[PDB]
Ligand binder design. Structure first.
Ligand SMILES: CCOP(=O)(COc1ccc(C[C@H](NC(=O)O[C@H]2CO[C@H]3OCC[C@H]32)[C@H](O)CN(CC(CC)CC)S(=O)(=O)c2ccc(CO)cc2)cc1)OCC
Lengths: 99, 99
């Protein structure tokens, strides 16, 4: 669909069988979700934001459905203030900016 | 135009008579610009993201030209690592997400 920006671009995602709400975030290189149990191996990583760095768990090749669109890619899990969908997955669902 | 998300959505903006590069960021409520000595009154603010909070100076009714599209609104100035155009200005230039 076409999503305006008068409100936060929040959508329902499905990951690990669980439904959650996430922010479509064109300023995020990567997808970062709040703490949750995800099956499969993971490796620790660091990511930096406006306020500094945090420690995250990196899950590769994770299936995630975003507003009805399937993606399979990297999902970071950690103390992010909000679930964010970043460009690594926004590209997979065909998302562009338009004005 | 239409901006794909393979790369960071960086565009040229014009503010305070200066040209800069800034990220079109749907995940940012408001616009945050790198340290600059803008004239006029301001109010202190703290904004949070990944890593915690930073202190910024909130200027109101600032004109910014973004890819030839004019917008006027609140601009936060502080030690951000990147110039960030947030939804408060993205709405004014007709920017939408589309997939
Ligand atoms: C670049 C060199 O410095 P750097 O490496 C990273 O620099 C940055 C690059 C992009 C951003 C933009 C930021 N993206 C981000 O956090 O993405 C993470 C995950 O994906 C990675 O890619 C980029 C960073 C990594 C997000 O889009 C917008 N944020 C809000 C969301 C936070 C989850 C929602 C709460 S907000 O900025 O905090 C913000 C809060 C309030 C207001 C006023 O309303 C305006 C803006 C910030 C820093 O860090 C130095 C150690």
């Amino acid at each position: 669909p076409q999503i305006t920006l008068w409100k936060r671009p929040l959508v329902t995602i499905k990951i690990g069988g669980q439904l959650k709400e996430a922010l479509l975030d064109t300023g995020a290189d990567d997808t970062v979700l709040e703490e949750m149990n995800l099956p499969g191996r993971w490796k620790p990583k660091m990511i930096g934001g406006i306020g500094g760095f945090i420690k995250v768990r990196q899950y590769d090749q994770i299936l995630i459905e975003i507003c009805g669109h399937k993606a399979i890619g990297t999902v970071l899990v950690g103390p992010t203030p909000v679930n964010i969908i970043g460009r690594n997955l926004l590209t997979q669902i065909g998302c562009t900016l338009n004005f």
